[PDB]
From Swiss-Prot, chains A, B:
Subunit structure: Homodimer.
Binding residues for Mg(2+): D15, D17, D150
Annotated active site: D15, D17
Function comment: Dephosphorylates specifically the 5' and 2'(3')-phosphates of uracil and thymine deoxyribonucleotides, and so protects mitochondrial DNA replication from excess dTTP. Has only marginal activity towards dIMP and dGMP.
Cellular component terms per the entry's GO annotation: mitochondrial matrix; mitochondrion
Main location: mitochondrion
UniProt cofactor(s): Mg(2+)
Enzyme class name: hydrolase
Cross-referenced Pfam families: NT5C
Protein name per the record: 5'(3')-deoxyribonucleotidase, mitochondrial
GO annotation (BP), single: pyrimidine deoxyribonucleotide catabolic process
Organism the protein comes from: Homo sapiens
Cellular compartments annotated: Mitochondrion
Length: 201, 201
């Protein structure tokens, strides 16, 4: 909930894909359904942020087939929420002096993706939560106390972002050793409130 | 153009409606075409940021008719650029140590608007410029040196934004007296380079 006027609430940016929405699981399900004669990468075996790069190493042509999955209509809209993600963000947004923004990047092929992300937030969080969406390809220019995001390396035009990046665990990053004092949120069942409280005055 | 790595380019946020895209002219054209038996508000006579409020005072029911114009498919996509706007932003983005983001708010009815804004930027600035788009309902959480925006009062969750807000003249704000030391950009023919240079080291 917002601070009283002129005041300063703790501000938390929450990524969508891989944090709220199950991109990896959705991808694999739809890939196997569309391309059942192709090999695939079990989640346990995912390595590197970029799905298509790993698929491209697995067999020639597979990078382009992978890309076609997330370029398809309804791919983003039909992603299932991560366990605990909707409940956690609803709780988080209800906390005093706590402003939560869903800060997500659309893919370059814009025909479906931005629309479906707004539709997905409406679906799970309601119409009033649409006020909390920020779409950007550069998160470093969005100011906040915390950024919860599954991507290990978040870069952009601001060399010294104001947020602390808390790495949200995903199949593709779960084995990564981080430079101290970088930290993780393992899942929404993990203690996200302790992380927020650590940044409060 | 971006700064060399680790470095800090001047960062300029540019609004879309009323700054790059002619919302007021597009609105009036389509309103008159759809509702030719209704009275309308000539641009010279526009007062207050909110079109529908002024229309609602003009005749009962007209606020809802106004709203229907910007909720229609192709309303945003078919907006014409302001004179000089495309050329200015292309030049601005080409300048050394200058990072330009188009920072715009989608309307609440998300079916067409976000998509059409990305399509409009592709159309006028090209595919690579899609990297520079930020969609947000809160510009105060986007950090920059300058925000060029026709809305007089820009507020949100950050009580002390990092940008200086430069008011872009529009029919609805042209008579407004601003609190010193707030300033204006009258049009894209006005000297925007002097404004940027005033913020450089
Ligand atoms: O984790 C991911 N893994 C992944 O393989 N992808 C796919 C989807 C598509 O996304 C992009 C992408 C790059 C940067 C930011 C968002 C998406 P593109 O828009 O360039 O096609 O990069 C290549 C592709 O990779 C996206 C994501 C998630 C992106 P985020 O959660 O929005 O930051
Ligand atoms: O100048 C304007 N005048 C105007 O009458 N409107 C119309 C369009 C619609 O926009 C909204 C609006 C409110 C805040 C930010 C963007 C749009 P809504 O999403 O709530 O329907 O407010 C009421 C409506 O008013 C928008 C704008 C421009 C908004 P901006 O350039 O994106 O900041
Ligand atoms: Mg992600
Ligand atoms: Mg505007």
């Amino acid at each position: 909930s917002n601070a009283a006027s002129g005041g300063r609430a703790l501000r938390v940016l929450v990524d969508m894909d891989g944090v709220l929405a199950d991109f990896e699981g959705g991808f694999l399900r739809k890939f196997r359904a569309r391309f059942p004669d192709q090999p695939f990468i079990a989640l346990e075996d995912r390595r590197g942020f970029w799905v298509s790069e790993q698929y491209g190493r697995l067999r020639p042509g597979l990078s382009e087939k992978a890309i076609s999955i997330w370029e398809s209509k309804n791919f983003f809209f039909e992603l299932e929420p991560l366990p605990g993600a909707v409940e956690a963000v609803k709780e988080m947004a209800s906390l005093q002096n706590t402003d939560v923004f869903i800060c997500t990047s659309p893919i370059k092929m814009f025909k479906y993706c931005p629309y479906e992300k707004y539709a997905w937030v409406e679906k799970y969080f309601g119409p009033d939560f649409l006020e909390q969406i920020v779409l950007t390809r550069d998160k470093t220019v969005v100011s906040a106390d915390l950024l919860i995001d599954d991507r290990p390396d978040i870069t952009g035009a601001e060399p010294t972002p104001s947020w602390e990046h808390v790495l949200f665990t995903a199949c593709h990053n779960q084995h990564l050793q981080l430079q101290p004092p970088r930290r993780r949120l393992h899942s929404w069942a993990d203690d996200w409130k302790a992380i927020l409280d650590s940044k409060r005055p």
